[PDB]
Amino acid sequence: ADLEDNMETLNDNLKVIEKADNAAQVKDALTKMRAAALDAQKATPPKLEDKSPDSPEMCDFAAGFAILVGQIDDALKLANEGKVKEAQAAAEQLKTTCNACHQKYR
Ligand code: HEM
Ligand SMILES: CC(=O)Nc1cc2cccnc2c2ncccc12
């Protein structure tokens, strides 16, 4: 899966989470998100393809997934404890991570 594919997975699954009723779908979606985030972490985006791997832009980019992955884990712990509404608020919060990265690198 390339970067676009992983982004679609992140987006589709975030929509499942916000619309859901139940812990099962929230857990499942978060789990798919986690996978997609770890996969995207290895990618170099179009805007950065001419930078060096240890340019601040590139380290910034990786840092944003590392945050996202941590946030997904936090929501997933919540969902595992049956705090569906709380897990769901956690998912909404981490849109900031999506949006702040897109603002620079999309
Ligand atoms: C859960 C959070 C996120 C969601 C919902 C999300 C959603 C999406 C979507 C719908 C697109 C368009 C994909 C396409 O062209 O078909 C996209 C593109 C992109 N996203 Fe995200 N994203 C998220 C997190 C991130 C993060 C954290 C970053 C950077 C750390 C990021 C970097 C990018 C890049 C660089 C593009 C453009 C990729 C390209 O055109 O090849 N995204 N994202
Ligand atoms: C500071 C940082 O996270 N650098 C990196 C950031 C990266 C971001 C996306 C793709 N690869 C890298 C990378 N690859 C090899 C060595 C370092 C990096």
Side-chain angles (χ1 to χ4, degrees), residues 53-104:
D54 279 313
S55 63
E57 282 84 7
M58 283 285 280
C59 298
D60 182 23
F61 194 75
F65 287 109
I67 293 161
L68 188 67
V69 164
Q71 287 166 324
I72 291 169
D73 281 343
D74 289 359
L76 189 67
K77 161 201 251 41
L78 289 181
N80 287 338
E81 302 170 357
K83 302 150 163 279
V84 176
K85 276 173 187 314
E86 265 178 80
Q88 284 174 125
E92 172 76 24
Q93 278 162 32
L94 95 216
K95 281 176 186 179
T96 292
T97 306
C98 317
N99 184 93
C101 178
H102 295 158
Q103 189 178 324
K104 303 168 277 181

Side-chain angles (χ1 to χ4, degrees), residues 4 7 11 14 33 45-46 61 65 97-98 101-102 105-106:
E4 288 155 284
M7 290 302 145
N11 199 56
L14 189 52
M33 286 181 80
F61 194 75
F65 287 109
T97 306
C98 317
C101 178
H102 295 158
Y105 298 119
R106 186 112 163 235

